[PDB]
């Protein structure tokens, strides 16, 4: 039941794939983190694919999306496809 949590401040896109069985953060990917400092939604996918590629490395297939105060915006979108296109299903 790994719970997914995507954070976005302004120009920083992040996704934290935690374990919702035992509070355990396993994977965390970010566009501005790895190196890519261009757009936020443009790479957002590529960020979700690397994330989903990460989380996947653990075997995280389905996730619990409970970002919280995060309205379905662009980032979470392109990022969510990445994460969902890569392997995660939340």
PDB file of C-alpha atoms in Angstrom:
ATOM      1  CA  UNK A   1       0.000   0.000   0.000  1.00  0.00           C
ATOM      2  CA  UNK A   2       2.983   2.287  -0.614  1.00  0.00           C
ATOM      3  CA  UNK A   3       1.678   5.856  -0.428  1.00  0.00           C
ATOM      4  CA  UNK A   4       2.830   8.296  -3.120  1.00  0.00           C
ATOM      5  CA  UNK A   5       3.347  11.969  -2.304  1.00  0.00           C
ATOM      6  CA  UNK A   6       4.297  14.571  -4.896  1.00  0.00           C
ATOM      7  CA  UNK A   7       5.631  17.886  -3.656  1.00  0.00           C
ATOM      8  CA  UNK A   8       5.941  21.124  -5.607  1.00  0.00           C
ATOM      9  CA  UNK A   9       7.078  24.488  -4.254  1.00  0.00           C
ATOM     10  CA  UNK A  10       7.482  26.783  -7.253  1.00  0.00           C
ATOM     11  CA  UNK A  11      10.214  25.554  -9.577  1.00  0.00           C
ATOM     12  CA  UNK A  12      11.022  22.378  -7.624  1.00  0.00           C
ATOM     13  CA  UNK A  13       9.187  19.196  -8.575  1.00  0.00           C
ATOM     14  CA  UNK A  14       9.437  16.189  -6.258  1.00  0.00           C
ATOM     15  CA  UNK A  15       7.794  12.809  -5.712  1.00  0.00           C
ATOM     16  CA  UNK A  16       8.160  10.754  -2.555  1.00  0.00           C
ATOM     17  CA  UNK A  17       7.136   7.125  -2.752  1.00  0.00           C
ATOM     18  CA  UNK A  18       6.673   5.993   0.838  1.00  0.00           C
ATOM     19  CA  UNK A  19       5.601   2.736   2.447  1.00  0.00           C
ATOM     20  CA  UNK A  20       2.102   3.146   3.899  1.00  0.00           C
ATOM     21  CA  UNK A  21       2.389  -0.089   5.883  1.00  0.00           C
ATOM     22  CA  UNK A  22       5.266   1.041   7.977  1.00  0.00           C
ATOM     23  CA  UNK A  23       6.175   4.699   7.634  1.00  0.00           C
ATOM     24  CA  UNK A  24       9.107   4.096   5.306  1.00  0.00           C
ATOM     25  CA  UNK A  25      10.336   6.400   2.532  1.00  0.00           C
ATOM     26  CA  UNK A  26      11.760   4.187  -0.213  1.00  0.00           C
ATOM     27  CA  UNK A  27      12.083   6.213  -3.406  1.00  0.00           C
ATOM     28  CA  UNK A  28      12.216   9.946  -4.076  1.00  0.00           C
ATOM     29  CA  UNK A  29      12.801  11.534  -7.479  1.00  0.00           C
ATOM     30  CA  UNK A  30      12.956  15.159  -8.611  1.00  0.00           C
ATOM     31  CA  UNK A  31      13.631  16.881 -11.942  1.00  0.00           C
ATOM     32  CA  UNK A  32      15.619  19.779 -10.463  1.00  0.00           C
ATOM     33  CA  UNK A  33      17.291  17.179  -8.238  1.00  0.00           C
ATOM     34  CA  UNK A  34      18.961  14.827 -10.708  1.00  0.00           C
ATOM     35  CA  UNK A  35      20.193  17.660 -12.894  1.00  0.00           C
ATOM     36  CA  UNK A  36      17.386  18.831 -15.159  1.00  0.00           C
ATOM     37  CA  UNK A  37      16.684  22.446 -14.220  1.00  0.00           C
ATOM     38  CA  UNK A  38      14.555  23.394 -17.213  1.00  0.00           C
ATOM     39  CA  UNK A  39      10.763  23.269 -17.125  1.00  0.00           C
ATOM     40  CA  UNK A  40       8.630  21.697 -14.396  1.00  0.00           C
ATOM     41  CA  UNK A  41       5.864  20.027 -16.403  1.00  0.00           C
ATOM     42  CA  UNK A  42       7.971  19.381 -19.509  1.00  0.00           C
ATOM     43  CA  UNK A  43      10.270  16.917 -17.745  1.00  0.00           C
ATOM     44  CA  UNK A  44       7.698  16.152 -15.032  1.00  0.00           C
ATOM     45  CA  UNK A  45       6.997  12.960 -16.963  1.00  0.00           C
ATOM     46  CA  UNK A  46      10.609  12.054 -17.396  1.00  0.00           C
ATOM     47  CA  UNK A  47      10.673  12.724 -13.657  1.00  0.00           C
ATOM     48  CA  UNK A  48       7.804  10.343 -13.064  1.00  0.00           C
ATOM     49  CA  UNK A  49       9.396   7.706 -15.284  1.00  0.00           C
ATOM     50  CA  UNK A  50      12.663   7.927 -13.386  1.00  0.00           C
ATOM     51  CA  UNK A  51      10.619   7.902 -10.191  1.00  0.00           C
ATOM     52  CA  UNK A  52       8.418   5.073 -11.339  1.00  0.00           C
ATOM     53  CA  UNK A  53      11.603   3.469 -12.535  1.00  0.00           C
ATOM     54  CA  UNK A  54      12.974   3.992  -9.035  1.00  0.00           C
ATOM     55  CA  UNK A  55       9.982   2.913  -6.978  1.00  0.00           C
ATOM     56  CA  UNK A  56       9.648   0.035  -9.400  1.00  0.00           C
ATOM     57  CA  UNK A  57      13.140  -1.074  -8.425  1.00  0.00           C
ATOM     58  CA  UNK A  58      11.557  -1.889  -5.065  1.00  0.00           C
ATOM     59  CA  UNK A  59       8.576  -3.472  -6.745  1.00  0.00           C
ATOM     60  CA  UNK A  60       6.108  -0.680  -6.060  1.00  0.00           C
ATOM     61  CA  UNK A  61       3.292  -1.344  -8.456  1.00  0.00           C
ATOM     62  CA  UNK A  62       0.376   0.510  -6.897  1.00  0.00           C
ATOM     63  CA  UNK A  63       0.579   3.613  -4.724  1.00  0.00           C
ATOM     64  CA  UNK A  64      -1.658   5.613  -2.419  1.00  0.00           C
ATOM     65  CA  UNK A  65      -1.890   9.139  -3.793  1.00  0.00           C
ATOM     66  CA  UNK A  66      -2.644  11.449  -0.875  1.00  0.00           C
ATOM     67  CA  UNK A  67      -0.554  14.510  -1.752  1.00  0.00           C
ATOM     68  CA  UNK A  68      -2.905  16.487   0.467  1.00  0.00           C
ATOM     69  CA  UNK A  69      -3.243  20.218  -0.389  1.00  0.00           C
ATOM     70  CA  UNK A  70      -2.229  19.573  -4.007  1.00  0.00           C
ATOM     71  CA  UNK A  71      -4.815  20.437  -6.646  1.00  0.00           C
ATOM     72  CA  UNK A  72      -4.596  18.367  -9.829  1.00  0.00           C
ATOM     73  CA  UNK A  73      -2.206  20.729 -11.625  1.00  0.00           C
ATOM     74  CA  UNK A  74       0.282  20.332 -14.463  1.00  0.00           C
ATOM     75  CA  UNK A  75       3.312  19.115 -12.500  1.00  0.00           C
ATOM     76  CA  UNK A  76       1.490  16.362 -10.605  1.00  0.00           C
ATOM     77  CA  UNK A  77       0.029  15.486 -14.009  1.00  0.00           C
ATOM     78  CA  UNK A  78       3.049  14.987 -16.280  1.00  0.00           C
ATOM     79  CA  UNK A  79       4.828  13.702 -13.208  1.00  0.00           C
ATOM     80  CA  UNK A  80       2.001  11.327 -12.393  1.00  0.00           C
ATOM     81  CA  UNK A  81       2.019   9.880 -15.914  1.00  0.00           C
ATOM     82  CA  UNK A  82       5.733   9.308 -15.524  1.00  0.00           C
ATOM     83  CA  UNK A  83       5.160   7.556 -12.242  1.00  0.00           C
ATOM     84  CA  UNK A  84       2.163   5.736 -13.723  1.00  0.00           C
ATOM     85  CA  UNK A  85       3.805   5.238 -17.110  1.00  0.00           C
ATOM     86  CA  UNK A  86       6.969   3.961 -15.471  1.00  0.00           C
ATOM     87  CA  UNK A  87       5.281   1.418 -13.191  1.00  0.00           C
ATOM     88  CA  UNK A  88       3.363   2.967 -10.276  1.00  0.00           C
ATOM     89  CA  UNK A  89      -0.416   2.863 -10.176  1.00  0.00           C
ATOM     90  CA  UNK A  90      -1.910   5.440  -7.817  1.00  0.00           C
TER      91      UNK A  90
END
